[PDB]
């Protein structure tokens, strides 16, 4: 369920695996190889990452997030506890309806994994992130 193809029957997920299969072997990037591997992963192994974690991780310590795209192979949920949302650019498999509205109205943009492949085909200036699996 994780090795050579996703167990998912979603046709559009198969189209993303097809796109990053090409990017993984025709480029010498470990980002395309890492993204392709995480597309085979199951829902349990792709935890959601909150909109607050993205804001915290980008503006952490020295911050200076500049405009690097935050990439997660998973769902970007919303954190209603945080009140001010920074200007963020996140590419994810799925955004919730509240998270997408909060990101857009509070400055920045939301992307899909195929919109980012056209902006950063080698994944340059990308902040690859993950959700905590402790659950």
């Amino acid at each position: 369920s994780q090795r050579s193809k996703p167990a998912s029957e979603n046709v559009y997920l198969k189209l993303l695996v097809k796109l990053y299969r090409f990017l993984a072997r025709r480029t010498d990037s470990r980002f395309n190889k890492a993204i392709l591997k995480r597309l085979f992963q199951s829902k349990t192994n792709r935890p959601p990452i909150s909109i607050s974690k993205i804001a915290a991780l980008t503006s952490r310590k020295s911050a200076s997030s500049q405009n690097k795209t935050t990439v997660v192979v998973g769902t970007v949920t919303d954190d209603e506890r945080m009140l001010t949302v920074p200007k963020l650019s996140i590419a994810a498999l799925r955004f919730t309806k509240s998270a997408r509205a909060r990101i857009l109205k509070a400055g920045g943009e939301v992307l899909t994994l195929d919109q980012l492949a056209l902006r950063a085909p080698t994944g340059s200036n990308t902040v690859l992130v993950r959700g905590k699996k402790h659950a």
Partner: protein, 362 residues
């Protein structure tokens, strides 16, 4: 992500009108054959009548075990006499007139639940599939002469009263090729199904979707194959028959204008469904060929290796027998001089008397 902006509305005489309708956002929803056929599988089970055997079948008789060691199987045999039942076994699956193993019960789960949001997703994805002519053809519809897909007709169709009025419209928009297909396909069903009020089978014709009824249902219901439905209660059993996407659907102008309120948009809530938004897609543009073969991506890929590669070394050749392979492996065999004369005319016998004495001992 780029689709046709508007659709044309056709009149009763099959002629185009100057009016047009913006394409509703439901036709831009993701098309999910996995999700449509999973929801269809559950919904198709929701009108099943229970069946079960009698609660006493195979146990109506009276029998007892004659015993163990009496040169016969220890299954109980019916008592009494005068009838051939004497000695015949029951209360068991193998025995004739016995209890069949695990008798069927009426409280088997006949119906199955689906989340209401998955159901709305499937119906949205099945409506989107009905705007793709290729999906209509692959599902068995004879739409090769239909003027346009989606096929929208005037609202005057909603007040047809006679079937011959409906047949004239289907012939004017070339939609009768599908009805003729359904009429020709009517066969007697195979199997025991025709002993059980399932006498005949046939194909599915166009699905006519109206807004308000003024005779459209009565004028279309007798045409073999055509199903008439209201835009407010669209049915996945009728939008993906058999779980297959791409039903040929004919809309009236009023039904097509009410699709935006029934389904809403991916950002704006549906008017007729409280707190419902159209599903979003994992990919914005679903043409993977366009992304892969794009200038953005093809400019940074390394030079592609060949396609199916040539077979180097199909057969192993021995250099010690094939002189040509030896010449390739060793660029020195051409000048070797294997036999070189060393001892020409000297050959001095080198064995002193001390060595000879030791050798010639005992």
């Amino acid at each position: 992500a780029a689709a046709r902006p508007t659709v044309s509305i056709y009149n009763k005489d099959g002629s185009v009108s100057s009016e047009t309708l913006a394409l509703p956002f439901v036709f831009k929803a993701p098309i999910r054959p996995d999700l449509v056929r999973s929801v269809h599988t559950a919904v198709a089970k929701n009108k099943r009548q229970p069946y079960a055997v009698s609660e006493k079948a195979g146990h109506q008789t009276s029998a007892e075990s004659w015993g163990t060691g009496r040169a016969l199987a220890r299954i109980p045999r019916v008592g009494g006499g005068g009838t051939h039942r004497s000695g015949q076994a029951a209360f068991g699956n193998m025995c004739r007139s016995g209890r069949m193993f695990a008798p069927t019960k009426t409280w088997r789960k006949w119906h199955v639940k689906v989340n209401q949001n998955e159901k709305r997703y499937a119906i949205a994805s099945a409506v989107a599939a009905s705007g793709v002519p290729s999906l209509l053809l692959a599902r068995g519809h004879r739409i090769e002469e239909i003027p346009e897909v989606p096929l929208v007709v005037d609202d005057a169709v909603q007040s047809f009263q006679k079937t011959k009025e409906a047949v004239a419209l289907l012939k004017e928009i070339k939609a009768y090729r599908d009805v003729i297909k359904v009429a020709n396909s009517r066969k007697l069903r195979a199997g025991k199904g025709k002993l059980r009020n399932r006498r005949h089978v046939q194909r599915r014709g166009p699905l006519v979707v109206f807004n308000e009824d003024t005779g459209i249902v009565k004028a279309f219901r007798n045409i073999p194959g055509v199903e008439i439905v209201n835009v407010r209660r669209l049915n996945l059993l009728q939008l993906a028959p058999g779980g297959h996407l791409g039903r040929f659907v004919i809309w009236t102008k009023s039904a097509f204008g009410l699709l935006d309120s029934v389904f809403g948009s991916t950002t704006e809530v549906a008017q007729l469904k409280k707190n419902y938004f159209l599903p979003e897609n994992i990919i914005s543009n679903a043409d993977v060929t366009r992304l892969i073969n794009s200038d953005e991506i093809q400019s940074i890929v390394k030079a592609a290796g060949p396609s199916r590669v040539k077979r180097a070394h199909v057969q192993k050749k021995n250099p010690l027998k094939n002189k040509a392979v030896l010449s390739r492996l060793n660029p020195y065999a051409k000048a070797y001089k294997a036999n070189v004369k060393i001892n020409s005319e000297k050959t001095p016998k080198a064995a002193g008397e001390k060595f000879l004495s030791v050798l010639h001992e005992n």
